[PDB]
Amino acid sequence: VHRIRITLTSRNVRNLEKVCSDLVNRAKDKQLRVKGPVRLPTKILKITTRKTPNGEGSKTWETYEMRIHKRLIDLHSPSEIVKQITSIHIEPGVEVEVTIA
């Protein structure tokens, strides 16, 4: 009736994995259909620019990369447990969002 979907979008692999491990461990501490992590395709943004501030010089083009990683988690937790786990899952560099309905 009340399914909680939370986002696990970030760029730091280590910290997003740590957040994902923490919530999965809590979801295994209290049985909530033990739904595990789900991995989404990486959204990588490729931009190519020049290096020379002026126009003089050889044709050199620098390509930069910007990739983000998304994960989704579905839980059957009650409101009190949901607010508790979100309180303990405060980490830097991790953006989370919960959709109710």
Partner: protein, 53 residues
């Protein structure tokens, strides 16, 4: 309150620029960056544009 002084615009140049730039040449609006190429080069690492390859 000034007439014939600053013409309002909605499209083209004179509508978008950067906070400390706006030369309108060699500037990208990709992903809503709205910054010059030189400024992007200077602060690419801070934003997250790391030369992986």
């Amino acid at each position: 309150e000034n007439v014939w002084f600053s013409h309002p615009r909605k499209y083209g140049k004179g509508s978008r620029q950067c906070a400390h730039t706006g030369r309108r040449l060699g500037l990208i609006r990709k992903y809503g960056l709205n910054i010059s190429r030189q400024s992007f080069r200077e602060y690419a690492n801070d934003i997250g544009f790391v030369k992986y390859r």
